Structures are given as structure tokens and as C-alpha cells.
Amino acid sequence: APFTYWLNPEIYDAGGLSRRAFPEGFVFGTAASAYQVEGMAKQGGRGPSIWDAFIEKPGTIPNNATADVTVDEYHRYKEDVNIMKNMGFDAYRFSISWSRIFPNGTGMVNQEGVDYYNRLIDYMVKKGIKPYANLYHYDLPLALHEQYLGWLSPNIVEAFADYADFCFQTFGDRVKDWFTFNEPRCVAALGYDNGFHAPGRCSGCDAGGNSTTEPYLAAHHLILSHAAAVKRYREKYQLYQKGRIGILLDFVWYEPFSDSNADRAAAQRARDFHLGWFLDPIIHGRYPYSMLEIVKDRMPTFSDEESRMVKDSIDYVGINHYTSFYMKDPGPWNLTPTSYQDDWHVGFAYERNGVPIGAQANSYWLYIVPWGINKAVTYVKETYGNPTMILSENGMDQPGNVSITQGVHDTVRIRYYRNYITELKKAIDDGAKVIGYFAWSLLDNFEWRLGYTSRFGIVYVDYKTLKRYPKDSAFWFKNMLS
Ligand SMILES: OC[C@@H]1[C@@H](O)[C@H](O)[C@H](O)c2nccn21
């Protein structure tokens, strides 16, 4: 419809933002993941992942949609990179599909898979887009899950390190910025606490599991796998390739509902279980105190050697930040362990004095709370010794069921980005060592359990034709970044 092409004046209101408002060399980019954008899930030599198996169960994804094709970046990568360049972005964080490189997780390399990533990276470099390569975004090769239950076995650690090592050796001559994992908290909690994500394990889940122990086991092995991969990079590659390696951690801002000691403690406890679970080991070589005291024997311990390997195993930390909630003390605690989520012993709140903390996006979990990004970045600065940070994801979603015509006029997303980036700038002006910002995501894509019912892109994708239509938010970035 002709209204698709109405010029939204919001595009040109940058709210005082520009590159001059950020540090010299500050990177702006977009982020996506292999499974969510590539397609060719069962082609090109790619081995099955745990999500290929998980999606097979009817009812798992709305309308039984799959990511077998999704937005087909496998074939359309030049177009996508061209849009990124045209909108003024400096960088693209993509992920490498483990099972596209090693169909069964180990051993035989799938050369067709290697050739794909080589094409993608060479084109990015040609067009002057900086590659940031994440090694893992939820896509464990099914064979490793079948062999020894994947993240639940110590066997996975060296399996991951070998895969990482291969990637460094193969792609590290042009990829200078690496991440080991996207959101290991999500991998552990959604995969093994409530089974919402693959492999769908939890207490009483059809696939089996134990919510009291398995999340902590998976998280422990993810931390070890991260540190073993970083060891490979540091000992064999870093000096020659002159790149950097880190990890991507989700961080919801938890704000005390009131200034009571109990509510402040509740908020800290939520931070500990959400972020500290991974960041305390990396920065201090130990788990958070609250977690140790609450979870006790159900949390694995690091050997002295492991602790040394894990501590300072990053050159920077990616903070994936979207939203904030209020946190309350929930009263006396139940003494019987039931789940990781229950181990937090906190109460969530979404409003205070009849006022919502913010408007909701399409996603049930996503509340629009711009001030939260400032508090979250300041918290990491003050708590973890002013580490080098990348704000590695930020964005919001519309319903999937919107047309091209209305889908492109995403004024709410412009406001989201203007406000959140403004609040991030305040944190940086106050001393936070943030070196980059990445929007989730360039394209509308396969949104895990929500399938195609959620649209996170700054570029609309018609799923019938796979044609791209930049939304007003993409043009907002284009104007702001120029
Ligand atoms: O929900 C939108 C996106 C996901 O598509 C993706 O897994 C990303 O890593 C992420 N972290 C928090 C939210 N999101």
C-alpha cells in the first residue's frame, strides 16, 4: 500500500545523538544468530542441532513454523550486508553454527559449511563491516546431546574448545572479535530449569530432567567450556591474530521495589542469580555468595586450576540488555529445593503506585524502561572493576501479524532506541567503559519459541517473498549515524 512510503518525521529526530556524542572508535552494529537467520537447516552438510529435534514435537512453535528457511541469509547475505552498510552500521555480530562446521560436534569438518562462513566474512570485509563472531547461540549439535546429554557432561568442555580452536584457526585472520556464548544463563535456565528451550528438560518434563540440579550443572560446564576456548585463543592465536575474545551475558535490571533493606537485598540476589552466576566466576574466580549459601551442594565447585583458568578469561563482556523489573522480598522462604528460578527467592513487580514500570513490547517479558540500561551499565562498572563492555544487544518487538504497510512505521521502536541509547550515553559520560552498541536485530527473524509471531527487526521481512523493507527505525539509525 502507498502508505508504506509516507516519510515519518520521527526518523530525523536523533534527540541530540550522533557519533560525536560517543567515544572515538565506538562501534555501532546489529546482532543476529545462525539458526534465527541462516536457513538451510537440513542442507549444505549441516548436522542436526537440539532445536531441529525440539521443533519436531507438534505445538512447540506457533503454527508449526520452522527455521529450515527463515529469512534465508544463507543465500541473501550480500543483500543483508548491503543494507547494514547503507544504514551506516560499522559491524555485524553473527553466530557460527557448530553443527554446520562439525555435523556431529567433533571430527569431520563440513567444508561446505566452512565455505559459507568464509563467503559471509569476506563480503563483510569487502563492504567494510566488522565481523564479530559468536560461537554458540543455542544450537548444540544433536549428536553430543544423544551421546552424553550435552551441557550436562564434563565431556562437552573439550568438545567446545576443539570447535572454538578450529574457528580461530580458520576465520581468525579476519575475525578479530569473538564471543564464546550468547546468554549461557538462558542456555542453562530455559534448557534445563523449565524446558522452554531445547533440549526441553526440567523436573517432570517429557524429555526428563531435574530443575534443582541440571541448570547449575549446565551453567558450570558452560563456564568451563568458555574458559577452555579462551585458553586456546590466548595460548595459540591471540598474539598473532591480534584480536579479542569475550562472552555475551543477558542482564535484566532489577530495581528495589522500595528502599527497605529486604527489597534492596532481593534486588541484589536477583542480580547475583541472573548475571553474577557467570560474571563472578569470570571476574573473581568464584560464584556469588548468595548462590553458594542458598544452592549449597547442588552447585558444582571449581578446582583451584579451573578457577584460575576461568578468572580473567575475557577481554570484554557483552551485556545484552532490554528490560527492567521491580524486585520485592517475597517473605519467608520455602526450604525444599524445586528450581533455579525458585532459588532466587524474590518477588517480581511490574508497577508501583498504580504506574507501570513501562509499556510492554510484543514479548511477555519485555517492558520498555530506558533508565534501566543506565543502571545496568553503571552496576557492571561499579561492581566488576570498570571492565571493558560492549552493549551487545538492545531492541524490542512488534506483533508478527502486522502488514508491510504498518510494520515499517515503527515509531515505538524509534522511541525505544532514542531513549535507551540516550540513557546508555549518560552511563558512558559517567565513566562506563562501553566500546560498542549492537541493536537486536537487523531483520525480523525466527524468534525461538515465538516463531514468527514476534518481529524484532529494524528491517521488515515479508515471509511470503523474503523481500526486505527497511522500517523507519533503520532510517532513524541511518540519520543518527551519519
Ligand atoms: O528475544 C529477542 C532476542 C533473541 O532472539 C536472541 O536469542 C537474543 O540473544 C536475545 N536475548 C534477549 C532477547 N533476545
CB contact burial 326-349 (16+ within 10 A = b; e otherwise): bbbbeeeeeeebebbeebbbbbee
Query: Are 64 and 96 spatial neighbours (Cβ–Cβ below 8 Å)?
Result: no
CB contact burial 188-204 (16+ within 10 A = b; e otherwise): bbbbbbbbebbbbbbbe
Give the number of residues written for the chain: 482
Could you give the C-alpha distances from 53 to 93, 153, 185, 357, in angstroms and in order?
A: 26, 19, 21, 38
Task: List the grid coordinates of 187.
Answer: 542456555
Bridge partner residues of 469 (DSSP) = 460
Could you give the C-alpha distances from 194 to 91, 197, 198, 210, in angstroms and in order?
A: 34, 8, 10, 9
* CA 186 / ligand 1 centre spacing (Å): 10
Annotated catalytic, 146? no
Look at ligand 1, atom 13, and give the residue with the nearest C-alpha.
322
Query: Are 361 and 328 spatial neighbours (Cβ–Cβ below 8 Å)?
Result: no
| 3-state SS string for the chain | CHHHHCCCHHHHCCCCCCHHHCCCCCEEEEECCHHHHCCCCCCCCCCCEHHHHHHHCCCCCHHHCCCCCCCCHHHHHHHHHHHHHHCCCCEEEEECCHHHHCCCCCCCCCHHHHHHHHHHHHHHHHCCCEEEEECCCCCCEHHHHHHHCHHHCCCHHHHHHHHHHHHHHHHCCCCCEEEEEECHHHHHHHHHCCCCCCCCCCCCCCCCCCCCCHHHHHHHHHHHHHHHHHHHHHHHHHHHHCCEEEEEEECCEEEECCCCHHHHHHHHHHHHHHHHHHHHHHHHCCCCHHHHHHHHHHCCCCCHHHHHHHCCCCCEEEEECCCEEEEECCCCCCCCCCCHHHHCCCEEECEECCEECCCECCCCCCECCCHHHHHHHHHHHHHCCCCCEEEEECCCCEECCCCHHHHCCCHHHHHHHHHHHHHHHHHHHCCCCEEEEEEECCECCCCHHHCCCEECCCEEECCCCCCEEECHHHHHHHHHHC
Q: Can you list the domains of the chain with their CATH numbers?
A: 1-482 (3.20.20.80)
State the angle between helix axes of 184-192 and 277-284 in degrees (0 to 180), rounded to the nearest 10.
140
Bridge partner residues of 130 (DSSP) = 91
Catalytic residue selected from 10, 38, 73, 183: 183
Method: X-ray
175: region left, alpha or beta (phi > 0 left; psi from -120 to 50 alpha): beta
Phi, psi of 367 (to 5 degrees): -105, 135
122: region left, alpha or beta (phi > 0 left; psi from -120 to 50 alpha): alpha
* CA 456 / ligand 1 centre spacing (Å): 9
C-alpha to C-alpha distance for 448 and 450, rounded to whole angstroms = 6
Q: Cell numbers 568464584 label which residue?
A: 286
Annotated catalytic, 183? yes
* CA 296 / ligand 1 centre spacing (Å): 30
Residue from 181, 197, 373, 393 to probe ligand 1 pocket by mutation (most atoms less than 8 Å from CB): 393
C-beta neighbour count of 386 within 10 angstroms: 12
Report CA torsion sign: 123, 85, 387, 255: negative
Non-local CB neighbours of 326 within 8 Å, separated by 6+ positions: 254, 255, 256, 257, 348, 349, 350, 351, 352, 357
C-alpha to C-alpha distance for 448 and 67, rounded to whole angstroms = 9
Ligand 1 atom at minimum distance from 440 CA: 3
